[PDB]
Design a protein around this ligand. Structure first.
Ligand code: SF4
Ligand SMILES: [Zn+2]
Ligand SMILES: [Zn+2]
Lengths: 754, 138
């Protein structure tokens, strides 16, 4: 289908259309004309990605300015989801236009899940894989390889065949979805990694996670070709602050402190051994210090850069010599002194929280190491190790943890907060102190991209309220517009199960524990839901420790055997290979006959990127409301900041986050306007948070559906599944809600130009 | 550590390690309250810390609680050197290279002091401290 935005031919991949998509095309294109942010909550019930890609693909290849497009979905499951759909639109657009592509678009995730070197790739953890490739393909190890043709430096030889044909050119033409990219690059025995990273300077549109935009440790290679006049989209942008606070926080444990001493000695060994053989290099980097921060070979490193910049991409750094620290023996004697002042604050008897400065002063009290030389630790260690060209990093792993912390605490002030918890209250009175350090303003991380980028979009199926984000993130918007679900049918059931059969209010807020009334009440609701819903049902505990306790003693009673008669039961394990082995067998059993039940945590991994289609999701449940003050006072501290820096109270922030992930979980069971399924809510507090739900969810949650006992919930969804099971296809009322092909849009909407 | 904290109470971490294991600024040694007190009370006698013969002084000890004595020496040495070289020109006019180099020289004595290689330069560092102290007096 090819209509007009009065200027933009739109090759929408489906001959049909949806109304809310067009309002989205209208207001995004309305947002793309004028520089703004215009948070646009697109209920996942329609295809927002299809509406997103069809217009911007039009816009960039219709308008000549916005040559680059950026689309940051939270997780890498959603990265390929965009990649495969963009591929379909692209083909469909070619299917109508022919060959007017001249288009390259590649996703961008990581080495481990792209490394075609088997030995490198057979490893599990991110660290050794990347580092293998490094010692395998290092601008030093390679130098150790061509200068010394020898067995010691392997190369992936994917990096090398990258180097040969690929670093002149690009991969043939494709919008290589990760399925397509690897196969080709494995067929070309090309490291798709070293491939895709080098055509970043060439891709028209780019698809990557929030960390690569927000985690500054990986947001260093930012190139202005993709950046300068580009157009930016935030998909599923409700978990932004958490990713920001995640990408800026830091931890410490006395055991890791012990590891650093070993490396410090191992460095005191490593510095000592290189200096006896070759210190004329170690001095050579001393004068490479005194001239400046040695950018010729600390940032201009093809395969060398050892310690990343945990700080923001090079804005808050000074360029001079680190005072005393120019000497490595300084640096190791300095590192010999820093690892010990933490151990005494480590053993601090109770929870004490300090500002970065008061701690920096208190540090300066016990030892006069200036903030300025202190800030230089990160790259100072990075270089030395490469001048050490160390073979191993494991002895030095706890060493770079400290370089991250010292740079952070000696640089940032007044936005962050230290806290010294000497134990974990869940296993209190044991030796395990923690030096927790975290951020409070999530506007800080986003400010540079808000400082850098001009035309940005904030879009999710769940964003609610669309104003908490301008408040926290401290930014300007234009069209904070959301759309309602205009349907010729109901298509889903949100319920508030406050009461059980006993008419008893239920919650997970009471504890993370057992109370046979609520538990058996919960056990009763689950087993009857397992009886009624078709294949594909999922639930969401507020916390895994809630899941673990409740489930364990659910097998204690007979509640688990009954659901085992009816359906399959597939738990969420912390190890996600087992979780993956669970989830696919859930989807497989969902697409198979015997029902599949997937039970997860509202704050867990499955809710982030995994979708629940027709069969993979019918009746989602939500046992209580996910809350976090189950744990310690870190939320209180940021909330205090949320309270002092912003006009945001404790409960309003907690209910917003609780309903932010509550909204995040309910929308996955639905894919299109043909999808259905129950989204029941099971807690008393859900009666009063009906407004906190997003509009399209709130439009479906009616007054009589509040505080329902579990009993009339089952009767309501019983008639729902029956009536929905009918083929109610008027095909003329769908002329209302499907806006039949290119005409009911062109007929009706071109009449609507009033 | 948990096996060397005193001549008397070498194993003190699980013997209520609340009593103080003082380094005499001239002992660099783990002396439980029993022995260190026994010592400075009688006076500057050696702490018998594992065959030790170095005088655990009178009440001139400092506090070092198990801070990796290679650091405790490195920390005790640097402060006195950074006090002997207290502000020898580092902010006289605002220079960053020379001050930092003078700083890079400042703790280089301390790194040498924390090392004491074959000591004839640590003695030269001591003469610098006397020169620095003589410069401080004037
Ligand atoms: S990118 Fe190349 S060198 Fe790195 S892990 Fe993959 S195959 Fe190995
Ligand atoms: Zn003793
Ligand atoms: Zn001693």
């Amino acid at each position: 289908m090819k209509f007009y935005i009065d200027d933009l031919p739109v090759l929408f991949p489906y001959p049909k259309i949806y109304p809310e998509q067009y309002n989205y095309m209208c207001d995004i294109k309305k947002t793309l004309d004028v520089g703004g942010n215009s948070i646009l909550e697109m209920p996942s019930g329609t295809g927002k990605t299809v509406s997103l890609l069809s217009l911007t693909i039009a816009y960039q290849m219709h308008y000549p300015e916005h040559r680059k497009i950026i689309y940051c979905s939270r997780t890498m499951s959603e990265i390929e989801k965009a990649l495969v759909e963009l591929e379909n639109l692209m083909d469909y657009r070619t299917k109508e236009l022919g060959y007017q592509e001249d288009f390259r678009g590649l996703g961008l995730t990581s080495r481990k899940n792209l490394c075609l070197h088997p030995e490198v790739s057979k490893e599990r953890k991110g660290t050794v894989v990347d580092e293998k490739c490094r010692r395998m393909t290092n601008g030093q190890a390679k130098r150790k390889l061509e200068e010394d043709p020898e067995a010691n430096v392997e190369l992936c030889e994917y990096h090398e065949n990258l180097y040969n044909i690929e670093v002149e050119d690009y991969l043939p033409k494709g919008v290589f979805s990760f399925e397509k990219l690897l196969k080709y690059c494995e067929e070309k025995t090309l490291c798709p990694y070293f491939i895709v990273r080098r055509m970043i300077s060439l891709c028209n549109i780019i698809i990557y996670s929030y960390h690569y935009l927000l985690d500054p440790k990986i947001a260093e290679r930012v190139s202005n070709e993709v950046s300068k006049d580009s157009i930016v989209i935030f998909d599923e942008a409700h978990n932004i602050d958490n990713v920001c606070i995640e990408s800026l926080s830091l931890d410490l444990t006395t055991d890791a402190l012990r590891r650093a001493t070993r490396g410090a000695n191992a460095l005191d060994e490593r510095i000592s051994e290189v200096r006896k053989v070759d210190s004329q290099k170690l001095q050579d980097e001393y004068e490479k210090l005194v001239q400046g921060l040695h950018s010729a070979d600390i940032l201009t490193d093809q395969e060398e850069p050892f310690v990343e910049t945990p700080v923001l991409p090079q804005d808050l750094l000074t360029e001079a010599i680190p005072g005393n620290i120019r000497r490595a023996e300084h640096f190791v004697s300095f590192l010999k002194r820093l690892i010990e002042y933490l151990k005494t604050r480590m053993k601090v008897l109770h929870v004490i929280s300090e500002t970065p400065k008061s701690f920096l002063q208190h540090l300066k009290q016990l030892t006069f190491i200036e903030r300025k030389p202190l800030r230089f630790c990160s790259e100072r260690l990075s270089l030395l190790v490469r001048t050490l060209e160390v073979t191993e990093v494991e002895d030095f792993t706890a060493l770079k943890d400290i370089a991250t912390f010292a740079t952070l605490i000696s640089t940032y002030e007044e936005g962050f907060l230290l806290i010294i918890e000497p134990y974990e209250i869940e296993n209190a009175a044991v030796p395990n102190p923690i030096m927790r350090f975290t951020c409070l303003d999530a506007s800080i991380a986003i400010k540079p991209v808000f400082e850098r980028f001009s035309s940005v979009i904030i879009t999710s199926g769940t964003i609610s309220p669309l104003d908490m984000y301008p408040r926290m993130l401290n930014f300007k918007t234009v069209l904070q517009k959301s759309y309602a679900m205009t349907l010729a049918k109901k298509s889903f059931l949100p319920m508030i199960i406050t009461k059980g059969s006993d008419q008893v209010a239920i919650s997970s807020r009471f504890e993370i524990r057992n109370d046979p009334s609520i538990v058996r009440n919960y056990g009763s609701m689950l087993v009857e839901f397992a009886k009624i819903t078709p294949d594909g049902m999922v639930v969401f505990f507020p916390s895994y420790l809630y899941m673990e306790s409740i489930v364990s003693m659910w097998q204690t009673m007979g509640i688990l055997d009954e659901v085992w008669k009816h359906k399959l039961i597939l738990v969420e394990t912390p190890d996600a290979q087992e979780t993956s082995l669970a989830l696919e067998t859930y989807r497989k059993a969902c697409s198979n006959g015997r029902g599949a039940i997937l039970l997860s945590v509202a704050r867990g991994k499955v809710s982030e990127g995994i979708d629940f289609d027709h069969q993979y999701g019918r009746t989602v449940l939500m046992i209580g409301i996910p809350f976090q003050y189950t744990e310690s006072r870190i939320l209180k501290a940021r909330l205090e900041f949320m309270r002092e820096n912003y006009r945001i109270r404790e409960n309003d922030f907690l209910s917003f986050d609780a309903m932010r992930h509550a909204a995040q979980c309910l929308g996955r069971v639905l894919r299109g306007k043909d999808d259905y399924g129950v989204m029941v809510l099971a807690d008393r507090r859900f009666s009063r948070k009906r407004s906190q739900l997003p509009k399209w969810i709130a439009q479906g949650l009616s007054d009589a559906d509040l505080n329902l006992s579990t009993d009339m919930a089952i009767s309501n969804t019983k008639q729902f599944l029956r009536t929905m099971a009918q083929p109610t296809d008027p095909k003329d009322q769908e002329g209302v809600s499907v806006w039949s092909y290119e005409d009911l849009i062109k007929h009706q909407n071109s009449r609507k130009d009033q | 550590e948990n096996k060397d904290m005193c001549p008397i109470c070498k194993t003190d971490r699980y013997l209520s390690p609340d009593v103080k294991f003082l380094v005499n600024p001239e002992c660099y040694h783990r002396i439980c309250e029993s022995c260190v007190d026994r010592i400075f009370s009688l006076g500057p006698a050696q702490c018998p810390y594992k065959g030790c013969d170095k005088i655990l002084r009178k009440n001139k000890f400092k506090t070092q609680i198990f801070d990796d004595v290679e650091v405790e020496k490195e920390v005790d040495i640097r402060k006195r050197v950074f006090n002997v070289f207290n502000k020898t020109i580092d902010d006289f006019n605002g220079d960053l290279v020379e001050y930092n180099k003078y700083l890079e020289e400042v703790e280089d004595i301390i790194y040498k002091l924390d090392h004491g290689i074959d000591v004839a330069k640590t003695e030269e560092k001591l003469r610098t401290y006397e020169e620095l102290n003589k410069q401080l007096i004037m």
